[PDB]
Amino acid sequence: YAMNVLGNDWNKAYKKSARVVGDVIGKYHPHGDSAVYDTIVRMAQPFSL
DNA sequence: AAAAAAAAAAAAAAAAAAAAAAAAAAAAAAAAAAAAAAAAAAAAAAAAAAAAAAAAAAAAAAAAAAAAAAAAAAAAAAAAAAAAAAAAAAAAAAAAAAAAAAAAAAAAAAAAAAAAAA
């Protein structure tokens, strides 16, 4: 939801993980940046999902 | 073959550390002035020594400041309670010599392989 609200569309330039993690922690998910970045990393990997 | 403990998966909680770059301070370790202390020379004020002397303890005795007695009154110091400072007694400890177990080099000799001769 945070990535969709920011505008990280599949046909647009990449945004840094720091910005997305900061937006998620600030707005929606108050549980520390390291876990959120680990979830983003696992979602991005081609051998996990 | 039963019990027990490690480890790994992924979203969660919470931490820790190494360097660069300049300018100032603070420890901490050195050369190097600078003065005590000590060994070994010559040198020179003090004790000795003697004769010669006269200044202060004895002695008479008055008298004038005195130390014990009496009294009143003020209140310093001593011993008993508590409450802090500061030092030996005893025990503990981190590196540190001693011992024991695993990694790397060593060649003796042979299995398997590669290569070529007639």
Structure summarized in a few sentences:
The PDB classes it as isomerase. This protein has 49 residues and is an all-alpha fold.
Describe this structure in words.
This protein is mainly α and 49 residues long. Helix content is 57%, strand content 0%. It has 3 helices and no strands. The chain has helices at 2-6, 17-27, 33-44. Helix 2 crosses helix 3. The protein is globular and about 30 Å long. The structure holds one DNA strand of 118 nucleotides. It is classed as isomerase. Keywords: DNA-protein complex, type IIA topoisomerase DNA gyrase, isomerase. The entry is titled "E. coli DNA gyrase bound to a DNA crossover". The protein is DNA gyrase subunit A. The organism is Escherichia coli.
Keywords, please?
DNA gyrase subunit A, DNA-binding, mainly alpha, 1 chains, 49 residues
Helix percent reads 55-70%
Shape, principal axes of CA atoms: globular
Largest sheet: none
Number of DSSP helices?
Answer: 3
Rg for CA atoms: 11 Å
Order of helices and strands: HHH
Query: What class would the helix/strand composition place it in?
Result: mainly alpha
Query: Between the first and last Cα atoms, what is the distance in angstroms?
Result: 19 Å
Strand content: under 5%
What is the total tally of β strands?
A: 0
